[PDB]
Amino acid sequence: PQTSRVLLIIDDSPEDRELYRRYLLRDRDHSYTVLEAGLGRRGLELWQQHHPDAVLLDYRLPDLDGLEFLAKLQPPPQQPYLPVIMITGQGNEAIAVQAMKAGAQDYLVKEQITPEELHLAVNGAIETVHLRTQLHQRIERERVVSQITQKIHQTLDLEEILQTTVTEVRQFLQADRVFVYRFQPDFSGIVVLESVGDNCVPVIDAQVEDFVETRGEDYRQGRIQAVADIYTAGLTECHVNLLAQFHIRANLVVPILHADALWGLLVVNQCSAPRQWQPLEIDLLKELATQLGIALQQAELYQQA
Amino acid sequence: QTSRVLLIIDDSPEDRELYRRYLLRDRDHSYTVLEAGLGRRGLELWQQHHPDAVLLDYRLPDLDGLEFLAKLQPQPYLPVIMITGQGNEAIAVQAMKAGAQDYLVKEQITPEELHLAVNGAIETVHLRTQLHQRIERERVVSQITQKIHQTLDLEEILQTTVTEVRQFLQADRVFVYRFQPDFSGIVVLESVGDNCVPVIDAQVEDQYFVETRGEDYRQGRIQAVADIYTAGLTECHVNLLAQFHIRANLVVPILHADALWGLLVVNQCSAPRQWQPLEIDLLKELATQLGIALQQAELYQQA
Numbered sequence: 034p035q036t037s038r039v040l041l042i043i044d045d046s047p048e049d050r051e052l053y054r055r056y057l058l059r060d061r062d063h064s065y066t067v068l069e070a071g072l073g074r075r076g077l078e079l080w081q082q083h084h085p086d087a088v089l090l091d092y093r094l095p096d097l098d099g100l101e102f103l104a105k106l107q108p109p110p111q112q113p114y115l116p117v118i119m120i121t122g123q124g125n126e127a128i129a130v131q132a133m134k135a136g137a138q139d140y141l142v143k144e145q146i147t148p149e150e151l152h153l154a155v156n157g158a159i160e161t162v163h164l165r166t167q168l169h170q171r172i173e174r175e176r177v178v179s180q181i182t183q184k185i186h187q188t189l190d191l192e193e194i195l196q197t198t199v200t201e202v203r204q205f206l207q208a209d210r211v212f213v214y215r216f217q218p219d220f221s222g223i224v225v226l227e228s229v230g231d232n233c234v235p236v237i238d239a240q241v242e243d244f245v246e247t248r249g250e251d252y253r254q255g256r257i258q259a260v261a262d263i264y265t266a267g268l269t270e271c272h273v274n275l276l277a278q279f280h281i282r283a284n285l286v287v288p289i290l291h292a293d294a295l296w297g298l299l300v301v302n303q304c305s306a307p308r309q310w311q312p313l314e315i316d317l318l319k320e321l322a323t324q325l326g327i328a329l330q331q332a333e334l335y336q337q338a
Numbered sequence: 339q340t341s342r343v344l345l346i347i348d349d350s351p352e353d354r355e356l357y358r359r360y361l362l363r364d365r366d367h368s369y370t371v372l373e374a375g376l377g378r379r380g381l382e383l384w385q386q387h388h389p390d391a392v393l394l395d396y397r398l399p400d401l402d403g404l405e406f407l408a409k410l411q412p413q414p415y416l417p418v419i420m421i422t423g424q425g426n427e428a429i430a431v432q433a434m435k436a437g438a439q440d441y442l443v444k445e446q447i448t449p450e451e452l453h454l455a456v457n458g459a460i461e462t463v464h465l466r467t468q469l470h471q472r473i474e475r476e477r478v479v480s481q482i483t484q485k486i487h488q489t490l491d492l493e494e495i496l497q498t499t500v501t502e503v504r505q506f507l508q509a510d511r512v513f514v515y516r517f518q519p520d521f522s523g524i525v526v527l528e529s530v531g532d533n534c535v536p537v538i539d540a541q542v543e544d545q546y547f548v549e550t551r552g553e554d555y556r557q558g559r560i561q562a563v564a565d566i567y568t569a570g571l572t573e574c575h576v577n578l579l580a581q582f583h584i585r586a587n588l589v590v591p592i593l594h595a596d597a598l599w600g601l602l603v604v605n606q607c608s609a610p611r612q613w614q615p616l617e618i619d620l621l622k623e624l625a626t627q628l629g630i631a632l633q634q635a636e637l638y639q640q641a
């Protein structure tokens with residue numbers, strides 16, 4: 034009975050919209066909340082305002098046809114693919130084939146739709162967009178990693194490597210802030226590099242003194258700190274106050290090891306809201322940190338020569 | 339127009355012929371169509387021909403669609419489209435849960451629906467396969483990266499690389515060819531199954547690179563040859579490779595500083611093999627990582 038999917042139906046026949054709603058009720062696996070529009074314009078507003086999990090789109094509407102509609106649909110950057118199923122007229126398959134090249138996941142012929150066919154198409158559209166998104170992110174993640182490896186092979190300057198790392202990581206994660214924290218001999222730390230958008234307070238020029246001496250045992254042993262919400266993570270009053278002071282709400286911290294030594298931290302922040310850090314994100318940061326370590330070893334070995 | 343192999347499993351010869359006609363109407367693709375009238379024969383043809391898609395009748399004399407699916411032991415995904423009777427949709431839903439990509443209602447089949455379903459099945463299996471490959475590929479690269487971070491031992495790094503790339507590619511042989519100062523070559527490491535004649539300790543000395551100095555490889559040339567016999571190589575080159583049962587060959591240069599240090603080579607020895615962009619890019623990235631390990635070992639030596 035709990036809503037498990039939201040579907041937007043855009044179709045100028047109210048009776049057909051009601052038919053598809055009923056058909057969806059037959060699905061034992063999901064509970065659908067259905068948004069309804071009779072015009073392309075209202076359908077676009079509902080898509081933008083309410084983010085449905087899938088769309089059933091009539092190939093012909095009073096104000097737009099399906100192709101014009103698809104063209105105006107902007108996906109979220111979180112999922113740059115459109116969970117759209119085109120419903121086309123009998124004998125009009127060719128138009129629907131064009132709709133798939135333009136981003137639709139599937140199509141149905143209006144007259145031949147059964148409850149089962151509908152559940153199938155909707156299931157498929159949602160699953161396929163999820164699959165396309167996963168593949169998309171792997172390609173991006175491999176690009177970022179491969180780029181750092183190339184810079185190291187080319188023996189480029191450490192500063193450029195850190196800068197590329199912080200920028201590309203922030204862009205990939207869509208994070209509010211990413212920075213590199215370097216430990217000095219006296220076990221003090223300074224922020225060396227920062228990439229920050231509009232959501233956080235810049236920290237590069239506003240840092241005082243601060244813990245590595247006393248509890249970097251975990252960082253030295255390569256462990257990461259993943260905090261979804263600073264208020265529910267059980268930190269000390271001081272630590273929470275410090276992070277809140279810079280509007281940090283979620284915190285992901287990965288150590289940078291040079292040989293066996295704790296050189297610094299690669300840190301990611303969300304400042305706008307809590308954020309659950311995901312396995313693929315954590316693995317990427319860990320791999321980048323390892324690469325930074327390799328770059329550090331290169332620079333030191335190069336220095337001694 | 340790309341070629342596809344499709345397997346039809348249906349005990350009605352007239353239905354098989356209808357779907358064959360329907361497929362030929364597709365102007366985008368060229369179909370080689372295999373046919374079976376029994377599930378048991380359909381299973382053996384699937385095993386022998388690895389078709390791009392399968393049309394599977396929900397009711398066969400020896401097996402039903404679900405039993406057939408259960409017996410398909412391929413981490414691949416199955417490009418199977420189930421064909422079910424009207425009113426038997428419940429069976430088709432079960433098939434979707436059991437690995438089928440799509441289903442069609444026999445009475446309702448049009449040429450267009452058939453093309454849509456076949457395309458979707460193939461495209462979807464392709465997505466899942468690529469995702470799988472990207473995940474495996476990242477593991478190999480990450481492992482090498484960890485090894486470089488943890489050690490200067492060039493041999494262990496080279497060894498891990500050869501073993502993992504071979505395993506990932508399911509290739510018959512992978513080896514590392516290192517150049518001597520005079521650009522003569524030696525095989526330093528080899529990973530080989532049973533399909534090829536081992537080339538370490540079975541040395542063929544070659545001087546071809548003393549002459550040219552691998553300059554084409556030094557500026558990054560990669561060689562990706564699917565079939566040594568049809569690639570337009572010289573009679574001699576072919577003969578040397580034929581001697582070691584090499585059938586397909588993939589060669590990626592290893593660069594140390596700006597110098598051609600050696601070659602990372604992969605061979606297929608049982609059959610021709612088209613090397614894929616993802617595979618070629620993985621080998622380049624690894625060759626680049628080897629370069630980093632080489633550079634590190636050199637800067638270390640100097641201290």
Ligand SMILES: *[C@H](C)[C@H]1/C(=C/c2[nH]c(/C=C3N=C(/C=C4/NC(=O)C(CC)=C4C)C(C)=C\3CCC(=O)O)c(CCC(=O)O)c2C)NC(=O)[C@@H]1C
Nearest residue numbers: 214224236240241242243244248269271272275279284286
């Ligand atoms: C409270 C008594 C004191 C204190 C405690 C404290 N600090 C940390 C961890 C970090 N402190 C960071 C300091 C900086 N400096 C910056 O410029 C900056 C942001 C711009 C920060 C966040 C710092 C980078 C860390 C890293 C880990 C993190 O959570 O961000 C901790 C946590 C230790 C642990 O391992 O849990 C504590 C308890 N800091 C003080 O200044 C106090 C005197």
Ligand SMILES: *[C@H](C)[C@H]1/C(=C/c2[nH]c(/C=C3N=C(/C=C4/NC(=O)C(CC)=C4C)C(C)=C\3CCC(=O)O)c(CCC(=O)O)c2C)NC(=O)[C@@H]1C
Nearest residue numbers: 515525537541542543544546561572574575578582587589
């Ligand atoms: C014909 C005149 C002779 C000849 C030609 C030849 N060889 C190459 C390239 C390679 N030769 C390789 C030699 C080795 N040694 C091995 O132990 C071994 C496999 C186990 C081989 C393959 C060698 C590694 C290469 C690298 C490129 C490759 O194809 O593997 C070439 C040119 C290749 C190109 O693309 O230019 C030629 C013309 N080798 C002989 O022994 C002949 C006398």
Ligand SMILES: [Mg+2]
Nearest residue numbers: 045046091093
């Ligand atoms: Mg209409």
Ligand SMILES: [Mg+2]
Nearest residue numbers: 153154440455
């Ligand atoms: Mg369908």
Ligand SMILES: [Mg+2]
Nearest residue numbers: 349395397398
């Ligand atoms: Mg039958």
Ligand SMILES: [Mg+2]
Nearest residue numbers: 157161458462
């Ligand atoms: Mg599909």
